[PDB]
């Protein structure tokens, strides 16, 4: 996260996903969710699946007689959309942990265009699928 | 955490022996610091500057149903591809 | 000579410096009253020496022998000329020594263990019914 | 003797004598008491977050 309209504006401080200041663990599910968010496994998996679907579509022209490639591309696109949905859900859920990313009544957090780019990416991928 | 307001009113004062030449100048100095805001700044420095620290349903309350839905979608897709592969073979 | 200033050790009023072992003089201590004693010194134009009370007590009259200890006991019998410390302004102490106008206003407050927000379980939608 | 809500200041101490404060105070904020606002047009989406 980078500072905006601040004294140290432009300082992109890395997001710490494991606040071990108080040395607390709570339940296993919270740690698992924190690890899943930290690796960003699901948005990355969505990107990988979209790339695989695109490469399958490109290779479909070379192999005209193999119709199963187009089906594989469609399956990859649908799985990419599903992974994007999972990533959005995990992102928002982990964001609810900290007060600055929650409590819209006072904080009034706003989602940026990068988040809406991923939301638009899911719709297009489902449409292409 | 501290909640509510003070139950009563007290204060900390500068203690000087009775009948001393430093009584009046210190009392004027204390008021001068409070008027200028030095006392408020000193309180802030040693308490906060050196410190070490809705109604609607959120997505966290219903995240499990979303996870179950997506897992079911994935399982159904896997079953469909397994059936298709078995039929093709 | 230098004004002797009795003081009681209490964070954050006065505490110990990180390198107080090698430090010597008034610089050995830091805290709210350390700067508070400094600001009055410049205004009144005098040099001060900060010292810690031997018994480490604020001061209370002993009804049996009528002896004052702590901040007030040092001042009445003349060990120190001024006390720079969080000394509460009370009726018993006022008739013995002189109190300036209060520099900090306080009172009785309530301390509670602050809650750690709330983390709903992933499968918390099954909560209304038992397993 | 002046028994009145007289603020203790530096310039007044230099001229007259004040006793210990019989009442402590400071600047606070006055706001209108919140009341039930008119519901928004799209207030039927309130129970669930956006």
Swiss-Prot record, chain A:
A Gene Ontology term for the protein's cellular component: postsynaptic density membrane
Cystine bridges: none
Key words of the record: Calcium, Calcium channel, Calcium transport, Glycoprotein, Ion channel, Ion transport, Membrane, Phosphoprotein, Synapse, Synaptosome, Transmembrane, Transmembrane helix, Transport, Voltage-gated channel
Domain of life: Eukaryota
Localisation per UniProt entry: Membrane; Synapse, Synaptosome
TM segment ranges: 39-59, 69-89, 117-129
GO biological process, any: regulation of membrane potential
A molecular-function term among this protein's GO annotations: voltage-gated calcium channel activity
Tissue: Brain.
Record-stated family: Belongs to the PMP-22/EMP/MP20 family. CACNG subfamily.
Disorder this protein is connected to according to its UniProt record: Defects in Cacng2 cause the stargazer (stg) phenotype. Stg mice have spike-wave seizures characteristic of absence epilepsy, with accompanying defects in the cerebellum and inner ear.
Role this protein plays: Regulates the trafficking and gating properties of AMPA-selective glutamate receptors (AMPARs). Promotes their targeting to the cell membrane and synapses and modulates their gating properties by slowing their rates of activation, deactivation and desensitization. Does not show subunit-specific AMPA receptor regulation and regulates all AMPAR subunits. Thought to stabilize the calcium channel in an inactivated (closed) state.
Assembly, per entry: The L-type calcium channel is composed of five subunits: alpha-1, alpha-2/delta, beta and gamma. Interacts with the PDZ domains of DLG4/PSD-95 and DLG1/SAP97. May interact with GOPC. Acts as an auxiliary subunit for AMPA-selective glutamate receptors (AMPARs). Found in a complex with GRIA1, GRIA2, GRIA3, GRIA4, CNIH2, CNIH3, CACNG3, CACNG4, CACNG5, CACNG7 and CACNG8. Interacts with GRIA1 and GRIA2. Interacts with MPP2.
Protein name per UniProt: Voltage-dependent calcium channel gamma-2 subunit
Organism: Mus musculus (Mouse)
Part of the intact protein present: 66 to 194 of 323
Swiss-Prot record, chain D:
Record note on modification: Palmitoylated. Depalmitoylated upon L-glutamate stimulation.
Induction conditions: Down-regulated in the pyramidal cell layer of CA1 in the hippocampus by global ischemia.
Organism superkingdom: Eukaryota
Compartments, record wording: Cell membrane; Postsynaptic cell membrane; Postsynaptic density membrane
UniProt: L-glutamate binding residues: 5, 7, 12
Mutagenesis or variant effect for residue 10 to Y: Promotes dimerization. Strongly reduced desensitization
Tissue: Detected in forebrain. Detected in dendrites of neuronal cells. Expressed in the pyramidal cell layers of CA1 and CA3 and in the granule cell layer of the dentate gyrus.
Similarity remark: Belongs to the glutamate-gated ion channel (TC 1.A.10.1) family. GRIA2 subfamily.
Note: The postsynaptic actions of L-glutamate are mediated by a variety of receptors that are named according to their selective agonists. This receptor binds AMPA (quisqualate) > L-glutamate > kainate.
Domain remarks: The M4 transmembrane segment mediates tetramerization and is required for cell surface expression.
Role: Ionotropic glutamate receptor that functions as a ligand-gated cation channel, gated by L-glutamate and glutamatergic agonists such as alpha-amino-3-hydroxy-5-methyl-4-isoxazolepropionic acid (AMPA), quisqualic acid, and kainic acid. L-glutamate acts as an excitatory neurotransmitter at many synapses in the central nervous system and plays an important role in fast excitatory synaptic transmission.
Quaternary structure annotation from Swiss-Prot or TrEMBL: Homotetramer or heterotetramer of pore-forming glutamate receptor subunits. Tetramers may be formed by the dimerization of dimers. May interact with MPP4. Forms a ternary complex with GRIP1 and CSPG4. Interacts with ATAD1 in an ATP-dependent manner. ATAD1-catalyzed ATP hydrolysis disrupts binding to ATAD1 and to GRIP1 and leads to AMPAR complex disassembly. Interacts with GRIP2. Interacts with GRIP1. Interacts with NSF via its C-terminus. Interacts with CACNG2, PICK1 and GRIP2. Interacts with GRIA1 and SYNDIG1. Part of a complex containing GRIA2, NSF and NAPA and/or NAPB.
Descriptive protein name: Glutamate receptor 2
Species this chain originates from: Rattus norvegicus (Rat)
């Amino acid at each position: 996260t980078c500072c905006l309209e601040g004294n140290f504006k432009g300082l992109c401080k890395q997001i710490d996903h494991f606040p071990e200041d108080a040395d607390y663990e709570a339940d296993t599910a919270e740690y698992f969710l924190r690890a899943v968010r930290a690796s960003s496994i699901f948005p990355i998996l969505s990107v990988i699946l979209l790339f695989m679907g695109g490469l399958c579509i490109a290779a479909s022209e070379f192999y005209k007689t193999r119709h199963n490639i187009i089906l594989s591309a469609g399956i990859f696109f649908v799985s990419a959309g599903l992974s994007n949905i999972i990533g959005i859900i995990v992102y928002i859920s982990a964001n609810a942990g900290d007060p600055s990313k929650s409590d819209s009544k006072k904080n009034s957090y706003s989602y940026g265009w990068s988040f809406y780019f991923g939301a638009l990416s899911f719709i297009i991928a489902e449409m292409v699928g | 955490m501290k909640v509510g307001g003070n139950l009563d009113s007290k204060g900390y004062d500068i203690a000087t022996p009775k009948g001393s030449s430093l009584g009046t100048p210190v009392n004027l100095a204390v008021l001068k610091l409070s008027e200028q805001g030095v006392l408020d700044k000193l309180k802030n420095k040693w308490w906060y500057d050196k410190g070490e620290c809705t109604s609607a349903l959120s997505l966290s309350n219903v995240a499990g149903v979303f996870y179950i839905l997506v897992g079911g979608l994935g399982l159904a897709m896997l079953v469909a591809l397994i059936e298709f592969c078995y039929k093709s073979r | 000579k230098t004004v002797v200033v009795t003081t009681i050790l209490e964070s954050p009023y006065v505490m110990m410096k990180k390198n107080h072992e090698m430090l010597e003089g008034n610089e050995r201590y830091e805290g709210y009253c350390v700067d508070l004693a400094a600001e009055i010194a410049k205004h009144c134009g005098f040099k001060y020496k900060l010292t810690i009370v031997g018994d480490g007590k604020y001061g209370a009259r002993d009804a049996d022998t009528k002896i004052w200890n702590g901040m007030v006991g040092e001042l009445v019998y003349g060990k120190a000329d001024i006390a720079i410390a969080p000394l509460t302004i009370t009726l018993v102490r006022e008739e013995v020594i002189d109190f300036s106008k209060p520099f900090m206003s306080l009172g009785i407050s309530i301390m509670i263990k602050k809650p750690q927000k709330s983390k709903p379980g992933v499968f918390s939608f099954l909560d209304p019914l038992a397993y």
